[PDB]
Ligand binder design. Structure first.
Ligand SMILES: O=C(O)c1ccccc1C(=O)c1ccc(F)cc1
Ligand SMILES: O=C(O)c1ccccc1C(=O)c1ccc(F)cc1
Ligand SMILES: [Cl-]
Ligand SMILES: [Cl-]
Ligand SMILES: [Cl-]
Ligand SMILES: [Cl-]
Ligand SMILES: [O-]
Ligand SMILES: [O-]
Ligand SMILES: [Zn+2]
Ligand SMILES: [Zn+2]
Ligand SMILES: [Zn+2]
Ligand SMILES: [Zn+2]
Ligand SMILES: [Zn+2]
Ligand SMILES: [Zn+2]
Lengths: 233, 233
């Protein structure tokens, strides 16, 4: 159907949106510095199990996420991957672990989460420390495009569905000014986006970390926004 | 909660919240770069008429505001004051004017609105050109504390109810980082806030331009956020 928005999702609730066969986004909302933001993650069917990409931004949301998954899909979440160290990606990992989910992230992400004081995924994703690195993880490919929104941000591609989940390294088209860039590498971000373009030029659905999905034109859009921020005054 | 938040307010709709006898805030929402922000204005009864402080941030919202006022309160809005030149304060002035509301702002605000290509209130408020200047305007006192969020920003005090409307010069507590300060005077903002404290030490209610009301604590909170931003937090 049409993608759910912040005004449709009370804080504490989670919506699912089926993108293709065996692939959903999950959408949640969270209060953040005097505003409410939407936030996307991904769900990918993994045989008779589910692979989860990112938490629902907090413990309460992540418990709600698991309940909504049980209601709409009814298959067990067995593994989760967090795509960088911020709380909209790892906040809720403890809830996932308590539910029996094996939680994963790169050593970079685990390292930074610990420094920040955020929840730490249990298992390490090896083979992703160098820009351009790709590793298979069941029904998806994990890709480290280089530093962008954060130094550790990963993107996730679902080859069966041509779905590219860009996480917070990719902006929705509606967003024409930079988001939180305190941990960003502005100098490298466009270069990292071009790596994504070069590695997944066949992508048909592109899912930003926050907001409305689109196609590959989200990449150049993000670069345009990032470059404009870079040139601020 | 009690005070309404963005989750309780569909975009295009407006809520009224009675603060004290004959004093309400009006709350609306608007999209800003993929996120939704709440926004406050004020309504003050003056006899059998109403004084409006600030639009509801746009033509559609401001129409909804007038309809909600007539539905809930049922007294005519005869005058409106915009507290600075940004769209969330003058956006909807044309709607007000068309509806027979006399619109006001300082000459400074009117000029800046014009340069910005925004809607321009009809009438000019004298006696507010120097920091520390105050004038009575019906049931309120208008106060120019000096440059802060903008060089023209006004604050409004309702002496009958000890209600201080700080507009966007005052941040809500949940806001711990500076917002849009493109037009701000960061150097003078703390000094301007101190003028507010000095003039209205007896204030019991403090309404920020966006978000939850509180007490006079919101002033020093705002000063802390501004000084941190000044020092590149
Ligand atoms: O990804 C973004 O750009 C973004 C967009 C909207 C709101 C917040 C962010 C954000 O960065 C964030 C940082 C830390 C955190 F705990 C949660 C989120
Ligand atoms: O008052 C603020 O700091 C603020 C808070 C939330 C969202 C926007 C703003 C804002 O500055 C704004 C600037 C220009 C404009 F046309 C409308 C609003
Ligand atoms: Cl495990
Ligand atoms: Cl395991
Ligand atoms: Cl008039
Ligand atoms: Cl008149
Ligand atoms: O994020
Ligand atoms: O504003
Ligand atoms: Zn982030
Ligand atoms: Zn394990
Ligand atoms: Zn994010
Ligand atoms: Zn403003
Ligand atoms: Zn007139
Ligand atoms: Zn404002």
């Amino acid at each position: 159907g049409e993608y759910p928005t912040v005004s449709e999702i009370p804080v504490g609730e989670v919506r699912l949106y089926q993108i293709a066969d065996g692939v959903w986004s999950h959408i949640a909302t969270q209060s953040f510095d005097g505003a409410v933001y939407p936030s996307n993650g991904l769900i990918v069917r993994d045989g008779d199990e589910l692979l989860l990409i990112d938490t629902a931004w907090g413990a309460k949301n992540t418990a709600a996420l698991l309940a909504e998954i049980e209601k709409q899909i009814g298959l067990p979440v067995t593994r989760a991957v967090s795509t960088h160290f911020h709380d909209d990606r790892v906040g809720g990992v403890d809830v996932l672990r308590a539910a029996g989910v094996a939680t994963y992230a790169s050593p970079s992400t685990r390292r930074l989460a610990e420094v920040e004081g955020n929840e730490i995924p249990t298992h390490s994703l090896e083979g992703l420390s160098s820009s351009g690195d790709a590793v298979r993880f069941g029904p998806v490919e994990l890709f480290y495009p280089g530093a962008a929104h954060s130094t550790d941000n990963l993107v996730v591609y679902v080859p069966s569905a041509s779905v590219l989940y860009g996480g917070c390294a990719i902006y929705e088209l509606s967003r024409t000014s930079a988001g939180n860039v305190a941990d960003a590498d502005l100098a490298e971000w466009p270069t990292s986006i071009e790596r994504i373009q070069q590695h997944y030029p066949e992508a048909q659905f592109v899912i930003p970390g926050h907001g409305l999905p689109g196609g590959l034109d989200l990449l150049k859009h993000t670069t345009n926004v990032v470059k404009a921020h870079t040139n601020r005054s």
